[model samples]
Target chain A: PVLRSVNSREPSQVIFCNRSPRVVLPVWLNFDGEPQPYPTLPPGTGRRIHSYRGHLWLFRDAGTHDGLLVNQTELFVPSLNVDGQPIFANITLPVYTLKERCLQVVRSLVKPENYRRLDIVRSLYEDLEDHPNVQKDLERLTQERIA
Target chain B: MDVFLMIRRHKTTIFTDAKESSTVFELKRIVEGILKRPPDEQRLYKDDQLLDDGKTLGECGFTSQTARPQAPATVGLAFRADDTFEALCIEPFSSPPELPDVMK
Candidate 1:
């Protein structure tokens, strides 16, 4: 039951195409300048990394392997937004896989437009691009998406 | 600067437990953590084109200082919504993967 129907932002009451809460955009994951190989999560099942009431998502891939996708929802973060008004920051989206010997960003339910809006919530992070603790910052994002 | 990345890798995937800010080069660092390779040694892409995140993640044939491409699932940041997952790939095995009528 990991894959289920989902809701949307607000006021508009506009459900997503598949009714999932998030969007997984197609992008390339570059690890030191190379394209890795992986599969994309089927859309329509819902990609609400930060809104679903569910936790611990499990799915069987075309390879017939079982996978775990966790739900991490958030409303506000204080540490990442130390410079201004509190915003949504990034939504928590944690996924677990049982595969071995490959590293890639297969597919994401969170697309660029939503990515832009999520970043907009964390305005202070706009300048954090050059910060030394960048990995730690990315960790914070993962936390929000899946927390 | 939340950088949304999508690769085709899985060998003990390395990702943040928390959502964080990113640049293309930083993303390379994250990939290096998982793939155990340097960012400068791979191919990076975006929007159906090679990426440059510095000089990094959103450039032309190359622009931003950058991160490289890798193997993984579908992932992105900033501009995304529901149903975007299926836009790039297929389920092939499940029946729409949508919630059953009972849930309705």
Candidate 2:
């Protein structure tokens, strides 16, 4: 009935898909759009925290609900603070987790053979877990490391 | 501007994963994330027609421009009640930033 929807109750609108970005993602963001560049804020600026718009989409994967994941991603400006001076002086990490995107980078660095080793995966995953991009298995991984 | 300006969020789809089970409010958040236009500043339509505030992801096609039939990429989502949500939560419709009351 929805596919053939006609009435106002039928419902219709745009969506920002988290997974399968390549399909629905904008071409302008091909190869994954990097977050926008923002100016830097110097110190002694009273430390103001500003929240930029970045989206975190969470979903249950088709099958399981274990360590692998249900998938999560973020797009858009995370946050910024310019201590009375707005210049690209220096860069600071945003509040959102950067584990997933960083994992993408490490995956690019290693061979499939290196992928299976738990130690190596944990090392690579851990090194970039807090950098400031998408991170996968972070919530569980963080706990696993401590446990 | 012309008699009718075709102002819209996108040339094609306004929201991604529309076929999913996200709520109307969730949809608004995703849209706001991309367009940077905020909610009150945004308006959406189904297949080139306007959509209601209570619309669900499964009901609406992924791409709004999708014809009479929703496409295969249509997303599905679970519903959440007790979601004390109101339309235009992110952006104010009447207070256009320039208005005095908006400043107040």
Candidate 3:
């Protein structure tokens, strides 16, 4: 129910680089927190997004809906204070194994008191929560976060 | 006035500023300062067209006004692989790919 983007209106630009082996879809969170999809970016490709400060963007796997990492986080918000300078957001596949990545996502999802909404996280949890390796780790990780 | 240029190579993007009257060779020098690759080893392109070293940014239609927007003129970068500088390959994203979704 929380709005992920604000009406800051500070002109900003972002160049998204998809360095992963898999294709990805970049989604822009509107002021109402609705998903606005951009064209899919294939491996080794880049796209220029005309955005503003306080806007939120996230990347998901084009095939599996798994969340890709940006600066080791699941969310990317362009908060650079420069008036007109553009920033680069490089999308990377997690170096961690599947279990570790799931744990990391669960940790981030549960730790914050006021967590922002992420569709990719929900999709990832649903996709992997049933795995024998991930199910055990997720159970322990979720309990740890709650404690 | 200064013109901003975005140079993209694979996963890396280098943003730098140059004068509208600056030549493409001048831009390559700036890239060399950052990437440590010699100017001769570097090739820059605007879309599918190879940029000539002797041409000025203004002559290439890149001016301060044109470069001010969020979507500034982007130059794709490729490097010579061998010491002889004869093994240069085209930048993968320099030209549009066969698939429609290869580039956004």
Candidate 4:
């Protein structure tokens, strides 16, 4: 018998979410050596870009161009020291199907205090608001806890 | 020519029979056996210079190096996470990737 997982389809999503009140935040993405795509998220909202397919995801946050690498579910957000030096964080994650990747990220949004995580969930909410069918699958996920 | 290869991610040295004409992709295949990382995920560099798949190790100037007794020719290896391979892409050094200064 074929295993009919709730996420039978493929998942390929890089959802960007905004949690607070603000104007649109401009996004710049650098995939490999090619500079591509324009993505910006509205306040209390988010947007998804599917064009990127590189190991490094470089984004300029309007002003500060920080680098973020995908490692499992953790966003490997790097930092700078007081001396204007750089710091490293853990970064790892394979490119999963949108169906699988979305599930992994959605399952990770658990803490409200960690607003960044919550922002991701809120972004999913926006993505789910339109497709009632897709919405049901998300509800099924809560019951199943499968990523 | 015999070259001593060391992947940045590993503590071991991989000795291989390579010629000036051996392509970088050929060397990557050997690396795959050691690191269990596919060729696409592994980016070989002579220091900051990214090795191009389309070029030979000789073309990259590897065959020219005279491996010293204490210091063998070393190739830095970096791994890329999922995505960016259809299958993957490459070019030589200008600046390190768009990665953070910390990561570079």
Candidate 5:
């Protein structure tokens, strides 16, 4: 199901930080789940947006429309601060996707021989390895290791 | 009447409102709540001139013609870093990236 923006009169502010290496686009999801585009953000740059609580926001690769990560998720919603004051949210677009992060964690876990023996670590590794994206990343890592 | 202020630092802007008779010190207190910097650490400027904490918005020349919601008075906001105040340096705005066909 498509996510739609909710109505909330409370004014809020959000600082969108593009920490990713690729150019990103910020789109506000309106009440009907329609995309309202904002200014494009380059890597390492940021923009301040005046939004409202319950407003939905999304980030995407500017050239690909492939959804990007926003603080680990693909969708974001502005929140209000306590004391009834307007909320100030600092939203970061991370450099790596969730699958990429999982692959990174798995790679690190595999490095320490004894650590991989833990039941929890083994289960996590197996679960991540089952993901197609993680498998693709593993292949890339293997190629890098060989080279 | 309320005075609207757009306090900017680099690409970030903090929108705050206060009474027309509010002092710069009072404005700083509102900013401190969001910036986490105390009033003593904040240095606000209107076009290059420093805003004195003792003066009111009217005394600062924030008239109806200047400070409005549509045309809020732009004030540069800086915080003290160590012994010196952090400079308010704004870089050139980046051009919008090319959108994909789906987005277009």
Candidate 6:
């Protein structure tokens, strides 16, 4: 049903999808040089961005949420296509647990001259402790670290 | 006249151009078009002071066009949200245990 409104000529418009099973994510777009906040996308659902008009799309951290902070990613709208429909350039923001994200940042680092800066990074994910999977992910990280 | 523009966000640094007669808000729009960062949510700063939307590039102390200036040609953009732009350089880490693959 979401695809019903999409048009091919307006290549900037797109569909936002959430494949996670439990997370409800807030979506925003910098469309045609305008910043507009989108409704939250629940797990296993997809929605169309009807009014988008720019070649560039940026997904930013939604206003306020209880879960871990979602990192922002810039996407090119013109590149993604499927049967004449623009499908978010195959974009998917996997819902991450705070510990998962914490470990993810640590994993992205390539050396100590920079890993030493790790202490300053995870503070962004600190307040995500109250989420449903926070404790479990924390334990998971602990065990993985020990391994 | 070619002027330089710089944006800092999420440990990412973006450098671009600044047209003469452009306002801070205009610069924001250009960034929004290319970088997809909304201008309304952007808060610009230079030398530790906030940039006003109404101020033009010249008013903000940036040289408009003409010959290159000795100073670093750049603009600074920071979001007003919970996130901040700072110098964050991380060193690389070793990979985890390898996974079994049929093709390998």
**How much lDDT does each candidate structure score?**
0.32, 0.33, 0.71, 0.46, 0.69, 0.51
True C-alpha contacts between chains kept, each model in order = 0.00, 0.00, 0.00, 0.00, 0.00, 0.00
Off by over 4 Å in 3: A81-83, A99-147, B1-104
Model 1 / residue B30 / CA error / Å: 2.3
- The local lDDT score (0 to 100) that residue A26 gets in candidate 1 is 19
List, for all models, the DockQ compared with the true complex: 0.02, 0.01, 0.02, 0.01, 0.01, 0.01
| Model 2: per-residue Cα lDDT over A31-61, one tens digit each | 2322222232222122223322232222221
A-chain TM-score, model 4: 0.26
Residue range B1-104, candidate 5, lDDT tens digits: 78777888788787777788888898888888887889999888887788998998778888666788767888788888788998765443579666322222
The residue-by-residue lDDT of candidate 3 on B1-104, one tens digit each, is 78877888876787777889999999899899999998999888877578889999888878888786455778778888765433223344466436322112
lDDT of 3 by residue, A40-118 (tens): 9999998888888888787877755666777676678887747666788889987667665665555434523222233
How many angstroms is residue A49 displaced in model 2 relative to the true structure, after the best TM-score fit?
66
lDDT of 5 at B86: 83
Q: How accurate locally is residue B4 in candidate 2, as Cα lDDT from 0 to 100? A: 10
lDDT, residue A99, candidate 5: 65
First chain TM-score for all predictions: 0.17, 0.22, 0.63, 0.26, 0.56, 0.38
Model 6, B1-104: lDDT tens digits are 55665555555556676655678898888778876868777777774577889898778877754314424454556664456554333223458656323112
Pick the TM-score winner: 3
- The sequence of per-residue lDDT tens digits that candidate 6 reaches over residues A29-102 is 33223334456666667777654443443333232232332223323344444566755533445556666665
Ranking according to TM-score, highest score first = 3, 5, 4, 6, 1, 2
Regions of model 6 farther than 4 Å from truth: A1-147, B64-71, B82-104
Task: Please identify model 4 stretches exceeding 4 Å from their true place.
Answer: A1-147, B10-13, B68-70, B84-104
- State which docking tier applies to candidate 5: incorrect
Question: Would you list the rank order by lDDT, best first?
Answer: 3, 5, 6, 4, 2, 1
Q: On a 0 to 100 scale, what is the lDDT of residue A82 in model 6?
A: 50
In candidate 4, list every pair of residues with a backbone clash. Answer: A10-A99, A11-A97, A11-A98, A11-A99, A12-A97, A12-A98, A53-B84, A71-A92, B85-B88
**Model 4 over residues A1-147: C-alpha lDDT tens digits?**
011122213233454444423333332323222333355444456554432222223322222122223333322222223353333322222344676445434433333233343334576645433322322432553456444
